[PDB]
Design a protein around this ligand. Structure first.
Ligand SMILES: [Ca+2]
Ligand SMILES: [Ca+2]
Length: 318
């Protein structure tokens, strides 16, 4: 993707990077800025190479030494940046299901936003890591139609974005979602789940637009009237991700910062997991909607080497 904010380092020397990181870790009080300076400016692939080189000579896992050396929010950023995308998501997903007190917000964010390709690797990696399938763990922590929705999405088997646009199916899908929701008493949720999980994203974009032709309310408002709870939250997030994924993340970023304090879990995860996907488009949507940059809000809400790390993931003012 040409829309990430963290690009590969041109002058990449994987051994110099490991050596310098060890020097920085060992020194008194820890040289965080150097640790940050390197990793936030190396691609994930490049951090894998820094990782391999570093273990080849310290006897230690880079992640372990860093988990030791660093603390607080900055620890969370750095250890998340070290994992591959597939591994980072698998572990956030596992933490969302943690205990009985489920973090529906995080589960929803990831499952709703990840592509077929990403979920192929996410499902794979989750098994090797936790010795259970992702689907099994989702079934265990969620129920009702919320579970059905979450499970179907996690299979990552959306139709691929075809060559031919199927306008007949776009129109029928729009009526079907009308007929299953605002037209009828209550809701036919499995029609919603089927349509919204199986069709290509470019297709559903056109469906939700054509849906405005049949329904007094757009899809987002229709969801709000038809359902509630996790199910409603899931659908709302999903329709946002389909319509404008970058805006979706921009809005979640705004939300994590707009009020008192910071929702650091959401902020850190968005900045880490989207840095090499669409952070540029996220930054662009953010600035357009909110009049000020992402960079600026991060700066107001966070401090220290934590703040510097995040700003580097952001990659520019505006
Ligand atoms: Ca209804
Ligand atoms: Ca704030």
């Amino acid at each position: 993707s040409a829309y990430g904010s963290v690009k590969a380092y041109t002058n990449f020397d994987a051994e110099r990077d490991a050596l310098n990181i060890e020097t920085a870790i060992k020194t008194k009080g820890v040289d965080e800025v150097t640790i940050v300076n390197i990793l936030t400016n190396r691609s994930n692939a490049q951090r894998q190479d820094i990782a391999f080189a570093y273990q080849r000579r310290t006897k230690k896992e880079l992640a372990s030494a860093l988990k030791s050396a660093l603390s607080g929010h900055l620890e969370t950023v750095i250890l998340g940046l070290l994992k591959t995308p597939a591994q980072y998501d698998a572990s956030e997903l596992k933490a969302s299901m943690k205990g009985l007190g489920t973090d529906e917000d995080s589960l929803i964010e990831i499952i709703c936003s990840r592509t077929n390709q990403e979920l192929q690797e996410i499902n794979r990696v989750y098994k090797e890591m936790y010795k259970t399938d992702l689907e099994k763990d989702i079934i265990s922590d969620t129920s009702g139609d919320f579970r059905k929705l979450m499970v179907a999405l996690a299979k990552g088997r959306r139709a691929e974005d075809g060559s031919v646009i199927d306008y007949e199916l776009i129109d029928q899908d729009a009526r079907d979602l009308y007929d299953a929701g605002v037209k009828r008493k209550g809701t036919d949720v499995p029609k919603w789940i089927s349509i919204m999980t199986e069709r290509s994203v470019p297709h559903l974009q056109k469906v939700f637009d054509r849906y405005k032709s049949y329904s007094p309310y757009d899809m987002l408002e229709s969801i709000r009237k038809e359902v509630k709870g996790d199910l409603e939250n899931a659908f709302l997030n999903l329709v946002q991700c389909i319509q404008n994924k970058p805006l979706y993340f921009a809005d979640r970023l705004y939300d994590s910062m707009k009020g008192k304090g910071t929702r650091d879990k959401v902020l850190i995860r968005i900045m880490v997991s989207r840095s090499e996907v669409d952070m540029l488009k996220i930054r662009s949507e953010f600035k357009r909607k909110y009049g000020k940059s992402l960079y600026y809000y991060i700066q107001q809400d966070t401090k220290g080497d934590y703040q510097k790390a995040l700003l580097y993931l952001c990659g520019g003012d505006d």
